[PDB]
Design a protein around this ligand. Structure first.
Ligand SMILES: Cc1cc2nc3c(=O)[nH]c(=O)nc-3n(C[C@H](O)[C@H](O)[C@H](O)COP(=O)(O)OP(=O)(O)OC[C@H]3O[C@@H](n4cnc5c(N)ncnc54)[C@H](O)[C@@H]3O)c2cc1C
Ligand SMILES: Cc1cc2nc3c(=O)[nH]c(=O)nc-3n(C[C@H](O)[C@H](O)[C@H](O)COP(=O)(O)OP(=O)(O)OC[C@H]3O[C@@H](n4cnc5c(N)ncnc54)[C@H](O)[C@@H]3O)c2cc1C
Lengths: 521, 521
């Protein structure tokens, strides 16, 4: 059935086999069966690595044959004649079964190899169809690669019954698991995309595929964004990963101390940050949390960051910019009146309360100094301390107790923030000793209970001070070579947007200098 | 001439005298002279501190009399009758000559006292003029205060010749040094404003008059402006003094790394800074240079700043934010092509030269690292070093000499920057050893010769590092209590706008904390 040319090419290609191949035929008494039996015997003659066997008891189309390895029943089946245009397909199926490599990208083949699901493909062709072979070959390859993907290529010229029955009006025509699948010149990639959709596959899988970063910035508030802009501007491979782009500013309304901008809003400032970052094609990763830092085992190595989602990213340098949580009172009304008189920051909102009465919650240094600060510009301040005594430095306590527009209330626990539906009008608190409930009328409540830097995930890796802050020097260096930190999560002494952005720029320039100096190759 | 009421009031008011007064009359034979002689003798009777003398040889109007002290010839002269409405003026002139205080503000009297110039005032009045006395009194007071300011109040009813001759058609009518001066109800302030204009008086005099600041910020670039905004927002008395508001950004065009602002220009950013500062009514002083810091002699005292103009300002805290000068090549073409390809900053302009050829001038760490930095994103870098060897760390030199798109030229001195009338196209340099002249074609020249912090005026007062930078800690504290520093003039390791603004905010919050803690009264 092979002319002498086809036969000369085949002996050559068959030399390329590294594994034995069996051709297992299941035949009837038709001339077509005789033709197939002749072909398979002629192929087996061309190589000791190919053997032809017959099993006419099998419950499969007649004539058909399986291409497989000894001991195995895996591989493509041709039903009817595999010559005409399909000769190339037959040869390729032999080569692949016998160990010769495919020319497809190995990542694609590995994907096919590990497709989880059972798929029985059937493809109708005709011998004179110029376009069929590419499709037959793609599905053949899939069946060689994955025992759960089966393929029977069917010669419509032999099984004309099925052509009419299934109303196949054009070829190549593909079926899967009893349903029509597609027609025409589809590619292996397109076929896989249809059966292995990637629908509802986690971002973590994709994150594991990322190459190593030159710098990976963890946290995407103003410090991280600044760092990302400075880094990408130098042309290095810059990743910026964070839980929520924008950080704390996203949840604030009015901002009047972002230097050069008399008044803006948090959401707008966050959006401006995103535009600035995106000008430089930073790889921005959102809704991910770093859960562990694995320090590089050698200078010039790679640091790694594990995510809570289970991914691992790698980088030559890291900038940690995870900021802080600002502790809440956790009382009714607090959330309702955030931005409407409940505030966590005297530097930010102090000026809004000129001529108003306010409270400060907390009698540590922050709270006491906040109270002394506010007492300079507001009508009246009441400081509430939960404990029986203030914790602030004695000089501050003495200074506060000397102000005439200040009341200090000890053993006081806020029980509710009160407003009028739009703004704060007072607060209610309980004396923790007597249990008595009291009320103060006011327009503002400055919560000064404490900050919780977002740094517990670094315990044991990066040195932190007694308050949880990452210890940095003026260059934003930490105790780990190639790890830098910027913004509120650090020992930087004040926590403001303009301060954080400055620090992010510094940390970025330090990381860059570090990269220059550890390319000692 | 005095009724018994006028006479009873006078004896009382005359008790208030602390110095002897003489009334020196120059008379003729008219009834008017007899009236004046009678009045003066009647006044002298009322008090041992008042004496009446006559000198009819003097070359002055007749009748007239001078009000003065013994041994002196200084004071106001009344020509004709000083009764009617002018009685109050006569009494006041007696009281002032005899040591009783004026009710005017003493700063006004001190100004009058020290007016440099000779002014001979004459004022025409009439006895029935209700408005004249205030004017007569003002000029009388001036003559009591300053011997160079003379005043003769003239009774137009007595010297009617002069009324017609000088065409005085309404009173009060004032002349000075032979010229008409003014008519009507002018005030002492208005009179002084006309003869002691303050025209071309230096700003230094006005600066010496300022009260003490809570914070005085020296230098008004981005660091100082940020500091001023943070300070004024706390309601404290905030001064911002500098040579030129805006600092280095004023002379730059394109800025693409002021975080959140993808692209702006220097002049526009400087103007935005001015608007933000002015929202808080900072006392902004421009075109002044600090020439010396005098540290407070005690905690809670006042620091002082001398200016080159000779003023001295005082403040409870100081923030030094004077930035740096960026050293130039000082060669033809350099100034012409500033902003058009000559740049002093790889962080700022690096991205603009993607795919271009550039040079770096200077082979210290900055220059060498700048070159390695740029070599990552530009087509080619040539580094020119003036000396026979680079001064950079060996690791950097080794890294630079391994890059394939880099040439290093030693003993090289730039002689000219070349452009096409709008942008840089090359540079010319001389080999300092052989004297040979060579040319390089390029689009950018990064000058990395060095920074000169604006801090020599602090030598001996504030500790500086080996490069002239003010040594600060993370809180922007210096070695002098109550003196802070921010921005490029400090040991902050990188020199950028966003970094400087962050630092200014920090220094401001530190100064505020310092003020809270040194109000130990
Ligand atoms: C209500 C409010 C109003 C404020 N108003 C002002 C104002 O008017 N002016 C001003 O100057 N300052 C203001 N501040 C303070 C200012 O917002 C912060 O100082 C600033 O945002 C700090 O920036 P940052 O980048 O260091 O940290 P953040 O803004 O806190 O950003 C850190 C980011 O990293 C994320 N992150 C945390 N842990 C991880 C992790 N493990 N992995 C990945 N990502 C993580 C966080 O979710 C966050 O998105 C305000 C703060 C609050 C609470
Ligand atoms: C040409 C050029 C372009 C630049 N482009 C950028 C850019 O794109 N992005 C970026 O981030 N950075 C850029 N920079 C750097 C940036 O401008 C500076 O880092 C920044 O301005 C530093 O701010 P500063 O307030 O510390 O000092 P300065 O801006 O230098 O301001 C200090 C001010 O104090 C004044 N002063 C000095 N001595 C005294 C004295 N004795 N008394 C009173 N006042 C005094 C100075 O005259 C000056 O006005 C550029 C610099 C240059 C030279």
């Amino acid at each position: 059935m092979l002319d002498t040319n086809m036969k000369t090419q085949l002996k050559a290609y068959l030399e390329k086999l590294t594994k034995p191949v069996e051709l297992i035929a299941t035949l009837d008494d038709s001339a077509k069966s005789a033709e197939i039996k002749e072909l398979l015997a002629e192929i087996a003659e061309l190589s000791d690595k190919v053997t032809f066997k017959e099993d006419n008891s099998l419950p499969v189309r007649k004539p058909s044959f399986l291409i497989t390895n000894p001991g195995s029943n895996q591989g493509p089946r041709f039903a009817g004649s595999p010559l005409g245009h399909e000769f190339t397909s037959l040869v390729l199926a032999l080569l692949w079964t016998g160990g010769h490599p495919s020319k497809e990208a190995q990542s694609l083949l590995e994907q096919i190899r590990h497709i989880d699901g059972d798929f029985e493909f059937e493809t109708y062709y005709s011998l004179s169809c110029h376009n069929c072979p590419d499709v037959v070959q793609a599905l053949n390859l899939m069946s060689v690669l994955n025992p759960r993907i089966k393929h029977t290529a069917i010669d419509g010229g032999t099984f004309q019954n099925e052509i009419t029955d299934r109303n196949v009006m054009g070829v190549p025509a593909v079926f899967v698991n009893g349903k029509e699948f597609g027609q025409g010149r589809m590619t292996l990639t397109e076929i896989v995309a249809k059966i292995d959709t990637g629908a509802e596959k986690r971002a973590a899988e994709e994150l594991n595929k990322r190459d190593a970063y030159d710098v990976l910035i963890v946290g995407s508030g103003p410090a991280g964004a600044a760092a990302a802009i400075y880094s990408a501007r130098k042309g290095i491979r810059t990743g910026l990963m964070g839980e929520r782009f924008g950080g704390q500013i996203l949840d604030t309304v009015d901002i009047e101390n972002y230097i050069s901008v008399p008044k803006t809003e948090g959401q707008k400032l966050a959006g401006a940050l995103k535009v600035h970052v995106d000008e430089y094609d930073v790889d921005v990763i959102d809704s991910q949390s770093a859960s562990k830092l694995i320090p590089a085992a050698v200078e010039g190595g790679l640091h790694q960051i594990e995510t809570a989602s289970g991914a691992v990213l790698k980088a030559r340098s890291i900038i940690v910019a995870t900021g802080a949580k600002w502790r809440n009172m956790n009382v009714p009304g607090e959330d309702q009146y955030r931005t409407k008189g409940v505030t966590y920051c005297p530097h930010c909102d102090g000026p809004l309360f000129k001529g108003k009465r306010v409270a400060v919650i907390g009698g540590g240094n922050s709270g006491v100094e906040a109270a002394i600060d506010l007492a300079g510009i507001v009508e009246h301040v009441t400081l509430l301390e939960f404990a029986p005594e203030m914790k602030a430095d004695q000089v501050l306590q003495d200074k506060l107790r000397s102000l005439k527009n200040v009341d200090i209330i000890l053993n006081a626990q806020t029980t509710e923030v009160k407003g009028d539906g739009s703004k704060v009008v007072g607060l209610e608190y309980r004396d923790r000793v007597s249990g008595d409930i009291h009320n103060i009328e006011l327009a503002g409540i400055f919560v000064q209970i404490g900050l919780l830097p977002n740094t517990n995930w670094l315990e044991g890796a990066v040195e932190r001070n007694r308050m949880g802050e990452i210890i940095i020097d003026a260059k934003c260096e930490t105790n780990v070579k190639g790890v830098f930190a910027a913004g509120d999560c650090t020992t930087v002494p004040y926590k403001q947007i303009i301060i954080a952005t400055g620090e992010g720029a510094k940390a970025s320039l330090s990381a860059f200098d570090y990269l220059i100096r550890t390319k000692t190759a």
